[PDB]
Structure formats: C-alpha cells, structure tokens
Amino acid sequence: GSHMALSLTADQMVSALLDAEPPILYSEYDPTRPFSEASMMGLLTNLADRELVHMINWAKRVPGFVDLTLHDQVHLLESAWLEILMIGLVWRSMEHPGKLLFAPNLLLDRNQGMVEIFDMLLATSSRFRMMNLQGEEFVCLKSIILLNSGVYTFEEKDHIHRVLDKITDTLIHLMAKAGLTLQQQHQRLAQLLLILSHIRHMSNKGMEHLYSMVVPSYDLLLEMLDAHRLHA
C-alpha cells in the first residue's frame, strides 16, 4: 500500500526519510591527477554529478514530492540541488573540525580549499557539531530544503505547506523525545531554521562562482527526473 504524506506519524515520517537516504560516495580514484584549480574543481564536479543521480532517487521518496507535477518537481530540485549537496557536505564533516569531508577519500583542510564559502561551510559544520545535530533531525532538514527553497519562486502550494508542517511536527517530536522542554524545542527549531538561511546564502555564492567559470539546468533535471521512471 501507499501512505499519503499528510497521514504519516512522526515515526513513519522518520522511517520514510531514513530509508530514502542516499549513500556516501567516494571521490574518483586518480592518484596521478595534477593539483590545479580546474583539477580540484573537476574532482568536485564529478562527485556532484554522481550525487545528483542519487539525489533524484532520494527526492522521489520524500513524502509529498510525487504529489506534485513533473514541472513543479523540477522547479523545486533546480532551486535546491546545491543546498542539498552542501547540507550533506556539512553533515559528513561534523566529526572533522577544521576540515570538509567531501568524500571519505577527499578530506580537505582550510589551506587546501571556493575562497569565501569554505570557511562558511566549516562554520556551519561547527554549529551542527555544537548543537549535536542528530541523523533523524538532519534528514528532516534536508527534506525541508527540497520543499521550501523553490516554493515562493514559483491549493497545490497549500499541499507543500501542509507537508512542511508535517516535517516540523516530526522535528518537534524528536526534540520532545530527546528531553527538551517546550521552550527549548522552539529555540532549537528556530536555530536550525536560521542555519538554513545560511545554507541558502552559501548556495547563492556557490552558484555565482559556477556561472562565472554547463551547470545543472531546468532541462537536465527534467530529463533526469523523467528518466527515473525507467530505472530498475
């Protein structure tokens, strides 16, 4: 059978998101690769390209996402894809202070690293470490980025907002079970959502660089989302 998004309990929501999680990918094994700007950027581009395929699979499993039209799915992914890659990056890097774990075989320190955003990404990773962000909260945040980033760059909008309310209910439940008071729940929720505005900022600066050097477009993402129908 199929659960509709708005019917899910907090436990069913977490289970759906944990199950949908993509794998941690490795960087290309290429030891003799040269050190240049275009070289490192190439490693990152190749990694991002492969993550994007898993990202589509993940997006299709975020409750409510397939309730939208293909056109609306593409708009949301086009808005969110870099923010999603970045929150993934910051999550992976939490146990490596001062470094970004692009992949288990591509752990970069500050001197190796992108001029403005590296320190921003490190700052974000530190803040999640401080707050002791849990995996269950992380998957909720990532789903929020997907549903929210493109909603006001666009009944059907109402549905997205009701799904977002469901994810918020799920976050609150996790925080209540963790032993936070009503007031602490509200403060921690607020802190997390303000960090999302920083991730948006980082994505914007990231995109500016990418457009000045093509980059994932409406048309690529439309093809990839549609191509999902043909997978195993």
Ligand X SMILES: CC/C(=C(\c1ccccc1)c1ccc(/C=C/C(=O)O)cc1)c1ccccc1
**Pairwise CA distance, residues 129 & 99, whole Å:** 13
**Pairwise CA distance, residues 14 & 17, whole Å:** 5
The residue from 117, 133, 199, 221 that contacts ligand X (CB under 6 A) is: 117
Question: Does 178 sit near its own copies (CB under 8 A)?
Answer: no
Question: Does 209 sit near ligand X (CB under 6 A)?
Answer: yes
From 6-14, 66-74, 103-111, 167-175, give the range in contact with its own copies by CB under 8 A.
167-175
199 CB-side CA count, 13 A: 30
**What are 127's two structure tokens?**
């803040």
Asked if 90 and 125 count as a contact pair (C-beta separation under 8 A), the reply is yes
From 9-17, 22-30, 32-40, 196-204, give the range in contact with its own copies by CB under 8 A.
196-204
From 60-68, 140-148, 160-168, 206-214, give the range in contact with ligand X by CB under 6 A.
206-214
Local structure of 32: helix, strand or coil: coil
Question: Does 65 sit near ligand X (CB under 6 A)?
Answer: no
Collect all residues with Cβ–Cβ distance below 8 Å to 11 and sequence separation of at least 6.
none
Residues in the annotated binding site for 17beta-estradiol? 51, 92, 209
Where does this chain bind ligand X (CB under 6 A)? 44-45, 47-48, 51, 85-86, 89, 102, 114, 117, 206, 209-210, 215-216
Residues in the annotated binding site? 51, 92, 209
